[PDB]
Structure 1
């Protein structure tokens, strides 16, 4: 910024931080508005051979739901899934 040294010292002491290092206002550090022309890459399906849509047709591979039980026509107890594992306290900062 354009602040005088005295004002910088005062604002930094009031903050308790060095505000000059990280300034909310943006200066020349921002990217240039005009940029060199881009050339975006093509995807996996841009091939001239072995690219039949039948192989990569996602939608046509969906199927109607499978019917596990239908009313209209020992065994171990089971759960919807294995029980969730307990989370572990973060190493970087366990307590804020």
Structure 2
């Protein structure tokens, strides 16, 4: 910040940039090191009614894997059609912001 106008011109010319607008050293633009106290909000389960845990228990909704085929207990068995694991991924579009560097 304290560079003379001559040195500012020199370093601006040498770099090819306007360095004074984006100094890497921090001055008064940053936050104060003491702040007012926060008051944080509470989540959606902070209710006094209609809030039974059994209606919002994600862990108790997990179940064992579905057995599609088992050589032991579950036989898997017009021409049945072939399938893929998922549909083919669509091609990405070229960026409109800046397609080429």
TM-score by length of 1: 0.98
Higher helix share: 2
Instruction: Flag the structure with more relative contact order, 1 or 2, with Cα contacts below 8 A and sequence separation at least 6.
Output: 1
Deviations 1:10-40 (A, max 9, x none): 0000010110000000000000010000000
In the alignment, structure 2 segments of 5+ residues that lack a partner are 74-78
Aligned partners of 1:5, 1:32: CA distance in 2, in Å?
29
1:93 is matched with 98
Aligned partners of 2:72, 2:37: CA distance in 1, in Å?
64
How many residue pairs get aligned? The number is: 96
**1:85 positional shift:** 0.2
Aligned-residue Cα RMSD (Å) equals 0.5
Higher strand share: 2
TM-score by length of 2: 0.94
Deviations 1:46-71 (A, max 9, x none): 00000000000000000001101111
